[PDB]
Amino acid sequence: RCQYGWQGLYCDKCIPHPGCVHGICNEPWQCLCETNWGGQLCDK
């Protein structure tokens, strides 16, 4: 069901660390943040 690019207690995280700092994501290896955040990594 999932293993590559999906960690966590079960499966609900595309490891935002490697490539980003905060925010969310729905696909493997991606970066999704708000508009206030600048840059792909979406940091402060």
Curated annotation (Swiss-Prot):
Q: What is known of its domains?
A: The second EGF-like domain is atypical.
What disease does the Swiss-Prot or TrEMBL record associate with this chain? Answer: Alagille syndrome 1: A form of Alagille syndrome, an autosomal dominant multisystem disorder. It is clinically defined by hepatic bile duct paucity and cholestasis in association with cardiac, skeletal, and ophthalmologic manifestations. There are characteristic facial features and less frequent clinical involvement of the renal and vascular systems. Tetralogy of Fallot: A congenital heart anomaly which consists of pulmonary stenosis, ventricular septal defect, dextroposition of the aorta (aorta is on the right side instead of the left) and hypertrophy of the right ventricle. In this condition, blood from both ventricles (oxygen-rich and oxygen-poor) is pumped into the body often causing cyanosis.
Domain named EGF-like: residues: 13-43
- What tissues contain this protein? Widely expressed in adult and fetal tissues. In cervix epithelium expressed in undifferentiated subcolumnar reserve cells and squamous metaplasia. Expression is up-regulated in cervical squamous cell carcinoma. Expressed in bone marrow cell line HS-27a which supports the long-term maintenance of immature progenitor cells.
What this protein is called in its record is Protein jagged-1
Full-length numbering of the shown residues? 252 to 295 of 1218
The record lists its disulfide bonds as C2-C11, C14-C25, C20-C31, C33-C42
Its quaternary structure? Interacts with NOTCH2 and NOTCH3. Interacts with NOTCH1 (in the presence of calcium ions).
Its localization reads: Membrane; Cell membrane
Which organism is this protein's natural source? Answer: Homo sapiens (Human)
Main role? Ligand for multiple Notch receptors and involved in the mediation of Notch signaling. May be involved in cell-fate decisions during hematopoiesis. Seems to be involved in early and late stages of mammalian cardiovascular development. Inhibits myoblast differentiation. Enhances fibroblast growth factor-induced angiogenesis (in vitro).
